Amino acid sequence: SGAIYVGNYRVVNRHLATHNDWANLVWEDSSRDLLVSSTTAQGCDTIARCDCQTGVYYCSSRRKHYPVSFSKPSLIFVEASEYYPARYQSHLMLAVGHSEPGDCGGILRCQHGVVGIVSTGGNGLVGFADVRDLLWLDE
């Protein structure tokens, strides 16, 4: 679990979105595993606007942060699930690091701010849904 709070927006993994997120829907993309909902309270997360390939992510299954090198956002394979059939997920970045079920939503940050959130895992790889291209989050 986990979310990004910027302005009047809440960014969450689409597969973990609540009834409240869907009733206050702003935008969602199944191919990215992202959903953004509106909030009453003001958020203060800073979104990174960069091409960093290094950062630190929070891993809830170890209660630890890990430094990682990660790939550029691209179209990449997942496996099926209560939530998706096998498919390419777009805007996904991989890193060698630890993840397993429940680690989705952990934030990945670089020196510029929030880069994305954990969205996939397995085989000693962790995948992050990028949010750096969503320029509208700031306005």
Ligand SMILES: N#Cc1ncncc1CC(=O)N1CCC[C@H](C(N)=O)C1
């Ligand atoms: N996190 C994690 C994890 N770590 C290890 N094994 C499996 C997983 C689970 C996983 O990858 N997914 C299940 C939920 C939906 C995800 C998606 N974006 O399509 C895929």
Ligand SMILES: [Zn+2]
């Ligand atoms: Zn950066």
